[PDB]
Amino acid sequence: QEKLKIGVVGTFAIGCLFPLLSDFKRSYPHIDLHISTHNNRVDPAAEGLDYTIRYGGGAWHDTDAQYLCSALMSPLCSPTLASQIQTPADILKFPLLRSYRRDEWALWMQTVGEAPPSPTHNVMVFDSSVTMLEAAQAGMGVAIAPVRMFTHLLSSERIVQPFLTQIDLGSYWITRLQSRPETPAMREFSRWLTGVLHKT
Amino acid sequence: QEKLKIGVVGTFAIGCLFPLLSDFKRSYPHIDLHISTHNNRVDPAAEGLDYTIRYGGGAWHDTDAQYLCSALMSPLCSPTLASQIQTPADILKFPLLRSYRRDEWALWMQTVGEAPPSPTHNVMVFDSSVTMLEAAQAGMGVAIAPVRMFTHLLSSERIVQPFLTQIDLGSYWITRLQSRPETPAMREFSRWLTGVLHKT
Numbered sequence: 056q057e058k059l060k061i062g063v064v065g066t067f068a069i070g071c072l073f074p075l076l077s078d079f080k081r082s083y084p085h086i087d088l089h090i091s092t093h094n095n096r097v098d099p100a101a102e103g104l105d106y107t108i109r110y111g112g113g114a115w116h117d118t119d120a121q122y123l124c125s126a127l128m129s130p131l132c133s134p135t136l137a138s139q140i141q142t143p144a145d146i147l148k149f150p151l152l153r154s155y156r157r158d159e160w161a162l163w164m165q166t167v168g169e170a171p172p173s174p175t176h177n178v179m180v181f182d183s184s185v186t187m188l189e190a191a192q193a194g195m196g197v198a199i200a201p202v203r204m205f206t207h208l209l210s211s212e213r214i215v216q217p218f219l220t221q222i223d224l225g226s227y228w229i230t231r232l233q234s235r236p237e238t239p240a241m242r243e244f245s246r247w248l249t250g251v252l253h254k255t
Numbered sequence: 256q257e258k259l260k261i262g263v264v265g266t267f268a269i270g271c272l273f274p275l276l277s278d279f280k281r282s283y284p285h286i287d288l289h290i291s292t293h294n295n296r297v298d299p300a301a302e303g304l305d306y307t308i309r310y311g312g313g314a315w316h317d318t319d320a321q322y323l324c325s326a327l328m329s330p331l332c333s334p335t336l337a338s339q340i341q342t343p344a345d346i347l348k349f350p351l352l353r354s355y356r357r358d359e360w361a362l363w364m365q366t367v368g369e370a371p372p373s374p375t376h377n378v379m380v381f382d383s384s385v386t387m388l389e390a391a392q393a394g395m396g397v398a399i400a401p402v403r404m405f406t407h408l409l410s411s412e413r414i415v416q417p418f419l420t421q422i423d424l425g426s427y428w429i430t431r432l433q434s435r436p437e438t439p440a441m442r443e444f445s446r447w448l449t450g451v452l453h454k455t
Contacts, residue, residue: 076395092381093294183383
């Protein structure tokens, strides 16, 4: 067995990778895959990772980055909050949930032709979209997050996407520190993942 | 309005604090509470936090720590996996999910009188119990986590606690850097939270 150590942003692990892992096992049973999750703030060298799966723009320095898939974002909320939302302005009846990126709501509103929320609007800030969507399911506020990472919540009707409009503030990438040697197990995992994303 | 900035480990935010926030608002409407979540790895000074709510042993250096509540851990799994688990050894039919603490499973097994899992047992490692329990609901493996932080999953029957035995590897605390000035808003929030935990 060849060891492969990968640190995966939790949102991607839950929303994409984990359901696909048995297919990886089918194709490459000889690889001993060690998966750990992170909240997108991670130091691969410190954790001794081979690969990091992360959300971003693909422009990390001293890093070999390969695009995995898009991460278009849109408002997401409980069916109960959705019942009170007919137009984008209605979102502001409720508190807003966002990531550590300060202008996500300003940018989405701007895109659909609305003014940004008031600087004193109730906002809660999340390190992980997984946690954010738990809060959204509870009706704590309206979230904005990568919709394709939450298909399980949409299909089970625990969350709703009230509007079609989506914005791109980043995608999912797999990255290797340029100083980290690329092994056969790494090449195989990377090929499998980019491949299986294209199929599905 | 007096500003109060608090960074809360996501598991505690979802499992305890968020449901109680309206009670805080009722008691102290004059406080402008800015909540952000983290995965228990956080630098309060860097984030300019007033308080940090975190999981641990209460012995952080140069830190004023106040106990919030216990965090006893026990195995947790989907009803489907639970149907195949009658005794603790049966847990090992499945992959194990754990936090970045390497010996959680060894310690729980030891407590119930079993040998630790094999060093080659399939394990997935999680920065946040919230993410871990999402994986557990999906049947990825058997998790071990603070049971009282997941009452929403137990009550809605998305997760099951097959065994009564629990272990203590830490609790939830609220902490202030000793160099961070304590404001009236902080004292009020701390008093409210320790108070409301005792009531409920």
